[PDB]
Design a protein around this motif. Structure first.
Motif, mmCIF file in Angstrom:
data_model
loop_
_atom_site.group_PDB
_atom_site.id
_atom_site.type_symbol
_atom_site.label_atom_id
_atom_site.label_comp_id
_atom_site.label_asym_id
_atom_site.label_seq_id
_atom_site.Cartn_x
_atom_site.Cartn_y
_atom_site.Cartn_z
ATOM 1 N N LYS A 1 7.139 -59.855 13.532
ATOM 2 C CA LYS A 1 8.377 -60.669 13.381
ATOM 3 C C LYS A 1 9.557 -60.029 14.115
ATOM 4 C CE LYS A 1 11.619 -62.211 9.852
ATOM 5 N NZ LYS A 1 11.821 -62.337 8.394
ATOM 6 N N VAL A 2 10.356 -60.859 14.785
ATOM 7 C CA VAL A 2 11.562 -60.385 15.448
ATOM 8 C C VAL A 2 12.733 -60.917 14.601
ATOM 9 C CG1 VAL A 2 12.939 -60.311 17.518
ATOM 10 C CG2 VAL A 2 10.463 -60.514 17.698
ATOM 11 N N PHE A 3 13.408 -60.014 13.898
ATOM 12 C CA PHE A 3 14.537 -60.364 13.043
ATOM 13 C C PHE A 3 15.776 -60.722 13.843
ATOM 14 C CE2 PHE A 3 12.172 -58.173 9.826
ATOM 15 C CZ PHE A 3 12.661 -58.662 8.613
ATOM 16 N N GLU A 4 16.583 -61.625 13.296
ATOM 17 C CA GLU A 4 17.854 -61.953 13.916
ATOM 18 C C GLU A 4 18.766 -60.906 13.274
ATOM 19 O OE1 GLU A 4 18.337 -66.248 15.204
ATOM 20 O OE2 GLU A 4 17.638 -66.512 13.119
ATOM 21 N N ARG A 5 19.823 -60.511 13.977
ATOM 22 C CA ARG A 5 20.745 -59.470 13.503
ATOM 23 C C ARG A 5 21.211 -59.529 12.045
ATOM 24 N NH1 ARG A 5 26.413 -58.423 13.679
ATOM 25 N NH2 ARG A 5 26.703 -60.540 14.529
ATOM 26 N N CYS A 6 21.974 -60.554 11.698
ATOM 27 C CA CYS A 6 22.476 -60.656 10.332
ATOM 28 C C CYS A 6 21.380 -60.812 9.292
ATOM 29 C CB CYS A 6 23.544 -61.748 10.242
ATOM 30 S SG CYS A 6 25.016 -61.307 11.225
ATOM 31 N N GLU A 7 20.290 -61.484 9.658
ATOM 32 C CA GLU A 7 19.163 -61.640 8.751
ATOM 33 C C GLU A 7 18.673 -60.236 8.366
ATOM 34 O OE1 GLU A 7 15.547 -63.138 10.647
ATOM 35 O OE2 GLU A 7 14.556 -63.342 8.698
ATOM 36 N N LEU A 8 18.508 -59.371 9.359
ATOM 37 C CA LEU A 8 18.059 -58.014 9.090
ATOM 38 C C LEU A 8 19.078 -57.254 8.250
ATOM 39 C CD1 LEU A 8 16.004 -55.796 9.442
ATOM 40 C CD2 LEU A 8 17.144 -55.172 11.590
ATOM 41 N N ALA A 9 20.357 -57.386 8.595
ATOM 42 C CA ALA A 9 21.437 -56.699 7.887
ATOM 43 C C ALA A 9 21.381 -56.999 6.402
ATOM 44 C CB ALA A 9 22.790 -57.108 8.455
ATOM 45 N N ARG A 10 21.252 -58.281 6.070
ATOM 46 C CA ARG A 10 21.196 -58.690 4.675
ATOM 47 C C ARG A 10 19.963 -58.152 3.971
ATOM 48 N NH1 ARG A 10 23.751 -63.192 6.988
ATOM 49 N NH2 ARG A 10 21.749 -64.288 7.225
ATOM 50 N N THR A 11 18.833 -58.115 4.683
ATOM 51 C CA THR A 11 17.582 -57.616 4.121
ATOM 52 C C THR A 11 17.682 -56.130 3.784
ATOM 53 O OG1 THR A 11 16.250 -59.228 5.327
ATOM 54 C CG2 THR A 11 15.137 -57.258 4.519
ATOM 55 N N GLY B 1 18.456 -51.643 -0.430
ATOM 56 C CA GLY B 1 19.171 -50.428 -0.770
ATOM 57 C C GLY B 1 19.365 -49.388 0.305
ATOM 58 N N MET B 2 19.522 -49.830 1.546
ATOM 59 C CA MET B 2 19.719 -48.894 2.645
ATOM 60 C C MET B 2 21.177 -48.529 2.878
ATOM 61 S SD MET B 2 16.901 -47.923 4.001
ATOM 62 C CE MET B 2 16.389 -47.903 5.735
ATOM 63 N N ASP B 3 22.107 -49.340 2.388
ATOM 64 C CA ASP B 3 23.518 -49.049 2.610
ATOM 65 C C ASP B 3 23.954 -47.757 1.907
ATOM 66 O OD1 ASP B 3 26.069 -49.331 3.684
ATOM 67 O OD2 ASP B 3 26.722 -50.870 2.256
ATOM 68 N N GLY B 4 24.227 -46.725 2.704
ATOM 69 C CA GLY B 4 24.668 -45.444 2.176
ATOM 70 C C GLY B 4 23.557 -44.519 1.699
ATOM 71 N N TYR B 5 22.298 -44.886 1.938
ATOM 72 C CA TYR B 5 21.180 -44.056 1.502
ATOM 73 C C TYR B 5 21.258 -42.694 2.179
ATOM 74 C CZ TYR B 5 16.630 -42.474 -0.003
ATOM 75 O OH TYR B 5 15.626 -41.739 -0.583
ATOM 76 N N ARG B 6 21.334 -41.644 1.373
ATOM 77 C CA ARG B 6 21.445 -40.284 1.883
ATOM 78 C C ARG B 6 22.622 -40.158 2.854
ATOM 79 N NH1 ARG B 6 19.736 -35.809 -0.028
ATOM 80 N NH2 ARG B 6 18.907 -35.022 1.960
ATOM 81 N N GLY B 7 23.695 -40.891 2.547
ATOM 82 C CA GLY B 7 24.906 -40.868 3.352
ATOM 83 C C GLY B 7 24.898 -41.661 4.641
ATOM 84 N N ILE B 8 23.909 -42.534 4.823
ATOM 85 C CA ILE B 8 23.801 -43.319 6.058
ATOM 86 C C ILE B 8 24.216 -44.769 5.854
ATOM 87 C CG2 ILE B 8 22.307 -43.999 7.961
ATOM 88 C CD1 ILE B 8 20.364 -41.732 6.843
ATOM 89 N N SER B 9 25.285 -45.164 6.531
ATOM 90 C CA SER B 9 25.805 -46.519 6.418
ATOM 91 C C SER B 9 24.815 -47.535 6.975
ATOM 92 C CB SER B 9 27.131 -46.647 7.175
ATOM 93 O OG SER B 9 26.915 -46.654 8.583
ATOM 94 N N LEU B 10 24.954 -48.763 6.502
ATOM 95 C CA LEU B 10 24.095 -49.855 6.945
ATOM 96 C C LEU B 10 24.197 -50.051 8.476
ATOM 97 C CD1 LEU B 10 22.182 -52.134 6.036
ATOM 98 C CD2 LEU B 10 24.205 -53.557 5.627
ATOM 99 N N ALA B 11 25.409 -49.971 9.020
ATOM 100 C CA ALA B 11 25.622 -50.149 10.456
ATOM 101 C C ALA B 11 24.822 -49.138 11.303
ATOM 102 C CB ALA B 11 27.109 -50.067 10.778
ATOM 103 N N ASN B 12 24.599 -47.945 10.756
ATOM 104 C CA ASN B 12 23.820 -46.926 11.456
ATOM 105 C C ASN B 12 22.337 -47.283 11.451
ATOM 106 O OD1 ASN B 12 25.316 -44.531 12.614
ATOM 107 N ND2 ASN B 12 26.316 -44.737 10.627
ATOM 108 N N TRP B 13 21.847 -47.825 10.337
ATOM 109 C CA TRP B 13 20.442 -48.259 10.263
ATOM 110 C C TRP B 13 20.196 -49.419 11.248
ATOM 111 C CZ3 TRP B 13 17.065 -45.191 8.280
ATOM 112 C CH2 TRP B 13 17.340 -44.421 7.134
ATOM 113 N N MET B 14 21.168 -50.319 11.348
ATOM 114 C CA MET B 14 21.078 -51.459 12.263
ATOM 115 C C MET B 14 21.057 -50.965 13.722
ATOM 116 S SD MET B 14 20.786 -54.361 10.733
ATOM 117 C CE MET B 14 21.217 -55.473 12.041
ATOM 118 N N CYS B 15 21.933 -50.008 14.032
ATOM 119 C CA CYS B 15 21.988 -49.440 15.369
ATOM 120 C C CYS B 15 20.629 -48.826 15.718
ATOM 121 C CB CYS B 15 23.096 -48.389 15.456
ATOM 122 S SG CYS B 15 23.353 -47.752 17.144
ATOM 123 N N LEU B 16 20.043 -48.099 14.767
ATOM 124 C CA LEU B 16 18.730 -47.475 14.950
ATOM 125 C C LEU B 16 17.629 -48.514 15.242
ATOM 126 C CD1 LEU B 16 17.002 -44.793 14.791
ATOM 127 C CD2 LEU B 16 16.589 -45.398 12.339
#
Length: 130
Positions: free
Chosen positions: A1-11, A16-31
């Motif tokens: 599956k190829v996720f669309e940007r915001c779809e992935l962000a919400r998922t 529970g990835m936002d701030g996990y071990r100090g890592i913001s959601l935007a950093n996970w998205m960039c990765l």
């Protein structure tokens, strides 16, 4: 599956990835963006050391998942690398959480240092409602 940007962000937020071990959601998205282009079936063979990167976060078979053919490898996430190629990203997320529990944190991925570190990563989550 190829996720669309915001779809992935919400998922990712729901997982529970936002701030996990100090890592913001935007950093996970960039990765995810630079590793696979938000593609869950992406695989990359590393001819140099005989390991393969699997899935949306391009998790390496030498340390994190078992694929059987990688020499001197371990399976810290205790998963078949096959689990990292599903459309459902729950297992990939659980494994990504395990990866960052090590001292390197998000720095474990070279791509994050090159394309995300010290940059304005807000663009990856803007307008997604997260």
């Amino acid at each position: 599956k190829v996720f669309e940007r915001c779809e992935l962000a919400r998922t990712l937020k729901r997982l529970g990835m936002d701030g996990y071990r100090g890592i913001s959601l935007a950093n996970w998205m960039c990765l995810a963006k630079w590793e696979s282009g938000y593609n869950t079936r992406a695989t990359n063979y590393n001819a140099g050391d005989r390991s393969t990167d699997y899935g949306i976060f391009q998790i390496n078979s030498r340390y994190w998942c078992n694929d059987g053919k990688t020499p001197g490898a371990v399976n810290a996430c205790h998963l078949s690398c096959s689990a990292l190629l599903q459309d459902n990203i729950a297992d990939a997320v659980a494994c990504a959480k395990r990866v960052v529990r090590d001292p390197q944190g998000i720095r474990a991925w070279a791509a994050w240092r090159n394309r995300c570190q010290n940059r304005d990563v807000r663009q990856y989550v803007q307008g997604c409602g997260v």
